[PDB]
């Protein structure tokens, strides 16, 4: 495995996906994030391209990986939010656990709240 | 001393706010400073604002050589909060962008908000 130069550091910030939505008003739950390259250093983000709700879905999500910082907020009624941020380290098989706890005032059919991963492709990163 | 790979980490506390139209449809440019020169950097949108709940939408491009892609901020009903542009500061730490707006109100409109991302490794 031949590192990539510091010189040719790029930033690859095409990974996107979806958040699992709740079956529940209040819930407090996990989701895997698979497919990652193993022992790799990202920095998660928010995004949104979603029509609001207009029934106040909050969401708040943080990383269960060793030495992860950070927190994400989502909230899609009047005060808009789409914030924050988590520095993690995917797992030995590419993999990073999150904690998802909501708190929806209407949750009839939830449009996912979305992400985007952040790689820089430097080293063996 | 520059950073070894083996010590990568992210700075992505660079936060800011982009200049606010006084046009309803208008376009014009930011000088974003205080970058190390010649760093590369990623800029993605964020958002902690009330809505105007008149359609104010705003893309953003960058000026400099070698920056990609495309940020979309819409705050009405379809909410975009979207996109990402990888640049490098020049060589005094700065970097240039457009701003085109096309927003249905105009009164005292808050500011979309970004948020800079630094790979700090080498000497980035």
């Given at each position: 495995?031949?590192?990539?130069?510091?010189?040719?550091?790029?930033?690859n910030?095409?990974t996107?996906?979806n958040?699992?939505?709740?079956?529940?008003?209040?819930?407090?739950?996990t989701?895997?994030?698979?497919?990652?390259?193993p022992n790799?250093?990202?920095?998660?983000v928010?995004?949104?391209?979603r029509?609001?709700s207009e029934?106040?879905?909050?969401?708040?999500?943080?990383?269960?990986?060793?030495?992860?910082?950070?927190?994400?907020?989502?909230?899609?009624?009047?005060?808009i939010?789409?914030?924050?941020?988590i520095?993690?380290?995917?797992?030995?098989?590419g993999?990073?656990?999150?904690?998802?706890?909501t708190?929806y005032?209407?949750?009839?059919?939830?449009?996912?709240?979305?992400?985007?991963?952040?790689?820089?492709?430097?080293?063996?990163?």
């Amino acid at each position: 495995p031949t590192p990539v130069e510091v010189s040719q550091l790029t930033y690859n910030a095409d990974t996107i996906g979806n958040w699992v939505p709740p079956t529940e008003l209040k819930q407090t739950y996990t989701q895997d994030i698979t497919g990652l390259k193993p022992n790799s250093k990202f920095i998660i983000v928010p995004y949104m391209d979603r029509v609001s709700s207009e029934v106040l879905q909050k969401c708040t999500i943080t990383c269960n990986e060793v030495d992860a910082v950070g927190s994400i907020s989502y909230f899609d009624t009047s005060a808009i939010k789409c914030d924050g941020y988590i520095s993690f380290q995917a797992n030995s098989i590419g993999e990073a656990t999150f904690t998802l706890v909501t708190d929806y005032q209407g949750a009839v059919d939830p449009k996912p709240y979305q992400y985007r991963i952040i790689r820089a492709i430097v080293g063996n990163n």
